[PDB]
Structure formats: structure tokens, C-alpha cells
Amino acid sequence: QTQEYTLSHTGGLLGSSKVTTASNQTAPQRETAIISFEVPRKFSEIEYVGQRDATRFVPRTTEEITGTANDDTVVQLQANIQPIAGEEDMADQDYPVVVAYNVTQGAQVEIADVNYATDEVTLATDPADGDTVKLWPIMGDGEVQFRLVNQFGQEEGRVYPWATPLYRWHDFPQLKRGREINLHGSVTWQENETVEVLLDAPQAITWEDADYPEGQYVSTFEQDVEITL
Amino acid sequence: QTQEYTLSHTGGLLGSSKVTTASNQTAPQRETAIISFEVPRKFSEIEYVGQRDATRFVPRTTEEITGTANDDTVVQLQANIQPIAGEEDMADQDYPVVVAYNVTQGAQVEIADVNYATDEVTLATDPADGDTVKLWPIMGDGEVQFRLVNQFGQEEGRVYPWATPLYRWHDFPQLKRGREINLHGSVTWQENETVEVLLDAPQAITWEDADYPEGQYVSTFEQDVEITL
Amino acid sequence: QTQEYTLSHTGGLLGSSKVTTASNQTAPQRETAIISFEVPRKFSEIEYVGQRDATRFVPRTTEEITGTANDDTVVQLQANIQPIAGEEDMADQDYPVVVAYNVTQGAQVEIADVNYATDEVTLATDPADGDTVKLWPIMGDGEVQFRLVNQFGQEEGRVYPWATPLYRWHDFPQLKRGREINLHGSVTWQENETVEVLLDAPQAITWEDADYPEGQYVSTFEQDVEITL
Amino acid sequence: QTQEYTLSHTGGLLGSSKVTTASNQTAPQRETAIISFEVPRKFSEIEYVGQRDAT
Amino acid sequence: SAEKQISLYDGQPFISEQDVAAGDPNTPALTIEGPDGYVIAVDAGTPIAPEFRDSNGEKLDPSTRVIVQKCDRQGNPLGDGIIFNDTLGRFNYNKMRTDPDYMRKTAKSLMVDEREIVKVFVDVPDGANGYDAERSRFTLGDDTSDFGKAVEIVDHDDLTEGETQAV
Amino acid sequence: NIGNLSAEKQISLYDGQPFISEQDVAAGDPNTPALTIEGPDGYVIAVDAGTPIAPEFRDSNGEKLDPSTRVIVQKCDRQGNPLGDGIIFNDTLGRFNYNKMRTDPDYMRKTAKSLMVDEREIVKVFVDVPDGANGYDAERSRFTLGDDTSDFGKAVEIVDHDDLTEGETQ
Amino acid sequence: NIGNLSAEKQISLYDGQPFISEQDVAAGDPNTPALTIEGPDGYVIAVDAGTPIAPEFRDSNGEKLDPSTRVIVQKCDRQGNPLGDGIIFNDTLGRFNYNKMRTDPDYMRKTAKSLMVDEREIVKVFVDVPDGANGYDAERSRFTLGDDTSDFGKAVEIVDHDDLTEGETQAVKS
């Protein structure tokens, strides 16, 4: 009676009550938690198996950039940027590495060119004095791990002690058999034995802003599982 | 099928119909009854065992004190006062030995100091001319016994012929293993073989006034039992 | 021919010549010596045994505080204060944690309240402009050890290498069986094989001032021993 | 694998971090310290032998 | 070993709670409920910390009463099997949480299979303040200490007497 | 003269030591440990089935935090990695009566089980401050793990790794 | 429940770790190691014949240094001493095509041979900048050694020294 299933950063098999989202600590870097997975009312157990099971995670940050009469068109970011699957050609990245949106003009802000490893960007358009823009570059230079909870907060420990980096995460092209991710670890957790992902990085994270254009959800985490019903 | 249980001065296992409360006789001292315990509809029997079973009894009296333009702050009482568990320091008595309440000002009346064995008290506040105050000192200088009824009023007799005093009752600290009370006696009574506590003392007693601040019940009696279901 | 005995910070079995007292180094913290114990003319040996033998040590510091027309009543101290056995209620500390004495008015200075871990104090009285006051708070935040001397200064070493703190010293209530102190160590020293206690702390120490009210001796050390006659 | 070596008041086998220099106490004479020798990151041990070793 | 010593309280998942009004003893303020594959056990005597305060953070009237009670399935109270019939105006919270003798032990032992309920009924008779839970707590054990007892939890998987304990 | 002593030595740990560590903590952050003990090299330590603690955890204002607070001692291997199988002192805060429990036998509160700590392992003190509390501070707080001065309370057992013949096995 | 695991564990190293160390470098100073790996106590690590590297070595201004730049990984015993007997990955810089070579099987640059590292043994990353070029920074740079998440690439194999009986043998190997 074992059937594979999929999870999400939102609702799904949990109703947005047996799951939470959360930002992270930045000023002191801390291996904080951003997302949990509580077993809901029904299930007997859940199973994760790295080296058999998949994973996806698309993280982005947020900032705020004004404009000027003699606007710059150019920005710098304190969050290292890389491509995802190959070149930095925004047309063919398999999803963009940057998103932008003007606030005054409730409209997108398209990109002209990127200063690649300089971590600076050139835009296509010309913002105005005192005009606000929101950006959503991807998140790199940060670790990730899994762990577990014994119904209170007493951790069993961790799935697999060694971490994994996010620039690497972006680097490996998702959506390709063999080139998929398959971590290491093998676990099981029954009712209220919640799981929590952890992240250690300087920079922030963003799940929602209510002004992000592309589908209400700035980032995501998605995952495969093998459930006993 | 024997399970221990607890009784009260109110309702509980009796619905406030198979129990009554009552004051006492004062002008002629009489070993009167204040409280009964009728077996209700259901039970096969009840058992009390002194030297195994516990008891609690917190008795208070009532009076009425006016005030004056050149108010006194000071009172005398015709009811001897003692501490409960140790000193007469109202902060740490395990429950106060005096309660006061102004009637005009529907508010408490805090105490400054006590003339200890003089049976007089100093207050913290200043009452007004023609202003009424209600007090509830504890009750001492009085006996207590148990007895039994054969469904009419024909007494079997008494549990244990010798009495027990109430100043002593206050003296022994309740709420402490070993220092608990365990009287002498061993009885049993089935349906409608009611029990009645008895008290002989000069002073009155008070179960309710409807103006006592602390929880509707001026005094109490509480007790442990071993019931056959 | 083994008999137990007691030592002191003063005279006793040494005539105030085979013992000395001393202050400590403050500006550079040094594990200095404050007190010695030279064997006197007579004895064959002395024995100390931690885990069998007791100890007492009541250390206080000194300062000097002026006054003002619009006097403060309030002081701060660069010497952390704690209680001794329980609360900071000066009535019931088993000995005070602060002593004060005005110099102009050759009289005590009673305390009203303490800012507990703030290491500040409120007084009861009102000092005057240019009026001097001497205080004697207790000493905390400092180590202690024992050692030994081979008739010159060539140390054998130390009794027990690990230290012990003084806030802890105050904390453990003296004067209670089981709750007494019993350090670790086991030694013996014959004629002129003197012992020296050592202390490492920032703050000073005080044995005498000749103006301290309570018995000529600001601090003390006292100790049990097992002597061969 | 035992080899003789030499130390100094400065750096050398310690990088001027696993060694310190210091003055002394004068007003009260004290048997103070002027110089240390911390073992650095690498070594398994060090040995001194008077009646064999120099200074 | 499979046995473990624990102490329960309010902020847990399987436990449940609800506010209560005056004169409604049949409304349980706390509902403990057997998890799956986790039997628990309580010997003849174990502490409780029956903190039951008002909205305004005040212990309710001393005439208040607490009745712990076992319940089988069907959400059903049970008479054969009951623990801790007691008042409220008795505990002296600040000390009874610590002292060995102000401490309060159960009437008899207990076991709780994978699906069995326990309820904490509260008789506030009348003329009183309503109950709140967020300003209130509860316990059943002291595993940290020495003199006192604690709750004995076991995972059902590691046994062969599981069927006997199910009977 | 000085007496001989065994390798086993009886001590009591606390805040103001070098090899121990600490930090300040905010409310609603359990996983930020307030105390981080780290094994010294060539020094195993050991704890029998029961040893006291004096979990003094006060406020910036020198006040003990909320009784609903909880403390969790927890074992950890290296890498700062938490670990569950191996855990001590699952407790609330509002239960100790500091000023007596440092001293008395009845108020005393021992561990759950025994423990050992190699030349480098970590032990963490996590602190669940649920809500409505002030930020925790350490200078206004202390901590202990044993009672060696006394005559009824237990004490830590330290050993130098070289003195043993079973030291490699442990 | 958690699934049991072996002592052997498959990992991938990088800059932001505790035991690793780094430093900035200037041009024309090949003897300065920009990365100093350093054996943790009670943790042997291992590298088989071929394992990836991501030699990301950029400028202060976030630019890969001159293609004439070279990288030399090199084993070292204690004493901070380099060693010729035992050396990996002598290669240039302006060759890797960073953006994809962290990903593809083909760019992926494997080692020359295997390696073992006892509880305290050093490895260094010497960087031959020719001269007169732009200096090196680390914060604008990275480095790696393994591919543990994926399914085609190799990974670094760590073991705790306590979980073996051949530890004395590998200690004799050194």
C-alpha cells in the first residue's frame, strides 16, 4: 500500500496548516529553518530516500531600489549570481535568474545585460526619480540540511550530517533524468514527527511579497516522497 | 470496585440536594449541625476511615462594622484569632486569617497590622462615617464531631466519642504529607443513611453572604472517602 | 596522639608571628598570596584533607564614597554582588553582603534596598556634602588555590591544581552539615614548611581598616585541621 | 625521527604568535614571566634535557 | 530501553484543550488521547500541576473542582476507572510544583492504549469567572527529579505483550 | 609534603571557564544554544546516572524567565551536529527554586542517565523561550553540573586520556 | 525512525567550512597558497582516481584571472612542508568554462590519481599568476572537490578514525 507522492511549499497534502514557511537570520548567520513538514491527521508514515528520491528548490531574495532623474540603469547586488543550466542568456535559462518590477508603473522591468560574476546588472528601461523597483535575484552562497523532531522539539539529529550548497543547487540542471538530484539519507516519520529543512546563509529568502508578478510565490521547494497511503 | 473520591461543601456528587449547609446556635451553645451528607440515588455504600483518610475545613464567621468621621482603623473581635501555619504575617499564612470588604465602596479593605492574641486588628485604610464593612475572620474555640442517622433521625450514635478543637484545626498546617489530619473512626453508610457533622461553639459560622469577594463561599469543608463505585 | 583543631586569620596557634595577612594585586591580576600558615615552634606536623575537612572564608573589599548637598543615596560597585544563602534580604542573609559607615558622623549607614545584579545599592540615609563613607561589600568573581613551600620558597607545587570561585563560595551556605565545604586535596607539612593560600581576582581585599564597626576584622579565613599534637 | 633544533626570542618556529615576550615586576619583586613557548600547530612533542642541552 | 520517562503538559499535539464556562462540569477542559503505536503508563502515584486560572491570570474559586477521568473510545466517560477527584482551592501552586509533600499523587495506576481518551472535567459551580487555557497549564510527571515519579511511555512495536495490553 | 591523587578528579563545571562557551539568546528561538561545552583534548569527562544542575537562566534585568520556558541538555558529536539518542534534562524552568535548590537534597534535580564525552564532543543547552519573555543574557546568569564541595551531591569525573589502559576503548 | 548509515560518507568540499582555510594572493607569487585544507582530528578523508574540481578563482572585480594563470593542488605532510611525491591537478585557469563545468560530465575535470589524508595532513592550492595581472580575492571566489548530489559524478569519502582497525596501517602509510 505504498504510493509515491509530491509535496510543495504550499498546502497540497497539508492544507497550509501542517506546513509553514519562514525567512532566515541574516545579521548573525544561523542555520535557521524556513520550512517544515508536519504529518497531517491521516497518514501512518512518510519516507524519504536520497539516492532514490528527487528534490527541487528555487530560492530568491528581495530588495528595494529607488530611481533618479539621471537614473543609472545599473545595479549591484550583495548576493552572488550564477546561471542555472548553462549560459547567462536570460532567454534560455530554464527560468530567469533575476526578476524585476517597477512599483509606480505597475509593470515589469526587462533586462538588457548582466555583469556576470561582478554581481551587477544592466537594465533595459529607464526608472524615474523617487521611483521604486523590487528585484528578486536568485539565492546562492548558502548551505542546506534536513533534520527531524520528536513531537516537541527534541531533535533526533539530522538526516545526513554534511551540507549542500545552493550555487551548486542552481548549477545542476533540474528536469533531466540522471542529472536530477538525489541526496543521501534515509528516514521515516509518523504523525506529528515533523521535519524541518534548514538553511545557513547571509542573505535573506522570500516566499511571497504579494507584488511578485509570476504566480504569487517568489520561491519554492518541491519534493518527492514514498508514502504508506 | 473500590475507588477513592472527594466531597465538598457544595454539589459535586450530590447536586446540592443530597447535601445541606447550615449555621449554628450561639446564644445557647449547642452541638448543632452545619452540614450533612446524604447518600444519593446511586451508590451502594460509602466508607470513612480516620487514620487513613484526610479532611479539610476552613471556617469563618461574619460581622458588621460601621465607620465614623474620625474613623478608628481599629477593631476588636469576640472570636479568638490564631495563625494557621506559623506566623501571623498575612502575606504568607497559606490563606488569610481575616478578610474585609467595604460595602459603600464595593472594594476590599486591606490590613496593616494585627493585635495578635488581643483579638484586635488595625487596618490599612480609612472608612467613612456611616460606612459599612463586612469582615470574615476565622473561627476558633469550638469543638467538632461526626455522627450518623438511620434514615429517620434515630442516631446510631457517633463515630468517635471524643471531640476535636478548631484552633487546633487551623494550627496543624493543611497541605503537607504526614502533617495532614487523620482522625479516628471507621464507619460505613448506605442509601439515605446520612451523615451529619456537628459543631459546638459560641460563635456563628458562615457559608455564604453573596458579597464575600473570594469565590462565593465564605467557608468550606472538604473530605476524602473510599466509595464502592 | 592526633587531635583536630581550628585555625584563624589571626593569632591563635601562631601568635600573629607565624602567620601573616596581605592584600592582592589588582591592576595586573595575579594569583597572589593573602595569607600564610607557618608551622610554629612546637608541632611535629599538620594535616589537611579535603573531602574530610571543612573551611570558611568571608571576604570583603573596601572603597571610599563622598557625599553631596543633593546627595544621591545611590551607589554603583565594580565588584559583583550576590547573596550568601538564598535571597538578598539583608535581615536574613546569615551575615550582610554590604556594610557601610559614615566617617564624619561616626555611625553606621543602613541600607534601604539593593539593585541586585545591577551591582548598585540604595541607602536608607542622606549623606552630606563632602561627607566620607566607607563601604565593605563582599568579594566575588575570583579564584582560590592552595600551595606549599619547602622552607625557602621552592614550591612543592599545589594541593589540587584546579581552582575554586568565590561567588560560589558565598553561594554554598556555610553552617550546615552536608552543605559544608569539603575541597579536594591531602597534604602534610612539618616545621617551617609553610602553606600559603592564593587568590586571583581583579578586586582588592581587606583584612582590617581600624574603622570597620563589626569587630576589628573586615574579612576572615577559618579552617579545620588534624594535628599530631 | 628525532632532530635537534634551536629556538629564539622571536618568531622562528612559532611565527611570533605562539611566543610572547614580556617585562617583569619591579616595585614588588615577583618571580614573573618574561617569555613563553607554546607548541605550535604541528609538532607531536618537544624535549628539554639539562646536562645535555644548551642555553 | 524501550521504556522512557516523560512528563506531559499543555503545549503538545495529541493533547487538546478548550475554554470552559461557569456551571458546566460536562465540558472537558483537557482531552488527552492515545497516539498510534505509543502506549503510556502511570503508576499508583504521580504528580499533577493543575494550574487552572482565569482570563485575568487568577486561580479560580477554591470551591472549583477537578476530576480526571478515563474514557474508552466513543468519546465516552467511564466510572470504573477514575483518577484525581479533588478541589482546586488546595494546591498552593508556587510550592507544590517543587516540594515533595505539597506534591500530589494519583489514586491508582493507569494504562492508555493506542486509542483511548482521558478527560479533565472542571466543576465550577456558579458565580465565578470563566476558564481560559492560554493562561493555564497542566502536568502529570516529574522525570527530572529523584523522589518523584513520571510517565512511562513505550512504543507498541517493540513488544510481544502488545495483545495482552490490548485486552 | 603533598598526597598522591588518582587520575580521576572530582569537579563542577560552570560559565566562567575557557573550554565551555556561551552566547545570548532571543525569545522564540530554541535551536540557538545558550551553552556549548566542548571536549578538551586528552581529557575525557564522565557523568553518572544522576548529577545536579543549577540551571540559572535570568533576564537582562536579572530575573528568571517565564516558567513556561524549557531547558534541554543534549549530546552532540563533532560538527556541532545535534543528536537525539543521547539527551538529558528535558525540563521546564519554573520548577527549580534556585536559591534553595543549589543546596538542598530535596529540591536537587539530577540527570536522566549517565554520559561520557570524548577528547572532543559537544554538549548543547537549548532553551525554549515560548513567548512573552525578555531577551536572555548570560552575564546575569550561571550554570552548573555537579556538587563536589558538598557531601551528598555527586560530581563530574574527569580523566586524562593517557593514564588509562581502556582509554582507547571509551 | 532513521535509516542506519555506514561510516563512509559521500561529500563535496568548498570554501565556507571551518577546517578549510584561505587567504588572498597577489600576482607573481606562486608559492602563496590561496587554499589550505587541513586534516580534522579523528576524520580521515579519501579521494579516488578521479573527482571533479571547481577552481573558481576570480578577481576582486569578479572576473576570472588571466588564462595564463595556473593552479597546482599539492599534498603536504605536517611542518607546513610541500611535497613532490604526491601531487594532484596541475592545470591552467582560463580553460574550465565555469558556468557549465560545474554541471556537465564532459567539462568535468577529474584528478590525476587518488589520495588519502590522515587526522592532520595539509593540502595546498598554489596559484601561479604570471605577473602584472589583477590580484586574487577569495570572497569573490569559490572552490570545490566533489559531486555528491548527482548520479554520474564522484564524491569525497570521509570516515571517522574510531570506526576502523586499519587506522594504524594508514598511519604508517601517511
Topology:
This is part of a larger assembly, with four copies of chain A and three copies of chain E.
Chain A: E1 2-7, E2 32-37, E3 46-49, E4 55-58, E5 74-76, E6 100-102, E7 107-108, E8 111-115, E9 120-123, E10 133-135, E11 145-148, H1 166-171, E12 186-189, E13 195-199, E14 220-228
Antiparallel strand pairs in A: 1-14, 2-13, 3-12, 3-14, 4-14, 5-9, 6-7, 6-10, 8-9, 11-13
Chain E: E1 4-6, E2 16-17, E3 28-33, E4 38-42, E5 65-72, E6 76-87, H1 93-96, E7 110-112, E8 117-123, E9 151-155, H2 162-166
Antiparallel strand pairs in E: 1-9, 2-3, 3-8, 4-7, 4-9, 5-6, 5-8
Region (Disordered) (chains A, B, C): 1-27
Biased composition (Polar residues) (chains A, B, C): 1-9, 17-27
Protein name (chains A, B, C): VP4
Your description of this structure?
This is part of a larger assembly, with 4 copies of chain A and 3 copies of chain E. Chain A is mainly beta and 229 residues long. Chain A has 2 domains: 1-59 and 140-229, no CATH class; 60-139, no CATH class. Chain A contains 1 helix and 14 strands. Chain A has one helix at residues 166-171, and strands at 2-7, 32-37, 46-49, 55-58, 74-76, 100-102, 107-108, 111-115, 120-123, 133-135, 145-148, 186-189, 195-199, 220-228. Chain A starts with a strand and ends with a strand. By secondary structure, chain E is mainly β. Chain E has one domain (1-167). Chain E has 2 helices and 9 strands. Chain E has helices spanning 93-96, 162-166, and strands spanning 4-6, 16-17, 28-33, 38-42, 65-72, 76-87, 110-112, 117-123, 151-155. Chain E has a 5-stranded antiparallel β-sheet with strand order 2-3-8-5-6, with no helix packed on it. Chain E has a 4-stranded antiparallel β-sheet with strand order 1-9-4-7, with no helix packed on it. Chain A binds chain F through residues 30, 32-33, 147-148, 150, 153-158, 161, and chain F through 30-32, 72, 74, 79, 81-85, 87, 90, 126, 128. The PDB classes it as virus. The entry lists the keywords vertical single beta-barrel virus, internal membrane-containing archaeal virus., virus. Cryo-EM structure of archaeal extremophilic internal membrane-containing Haloarcula californiae icosahedral virus 1 (HCIV-1) at 3.74 Angstroms resolution. Chains A, B, C, D are VP4. The organism of A, B, C, D is Haloarcula californiae ATCC 33799. Chains E, F, G: VP7.
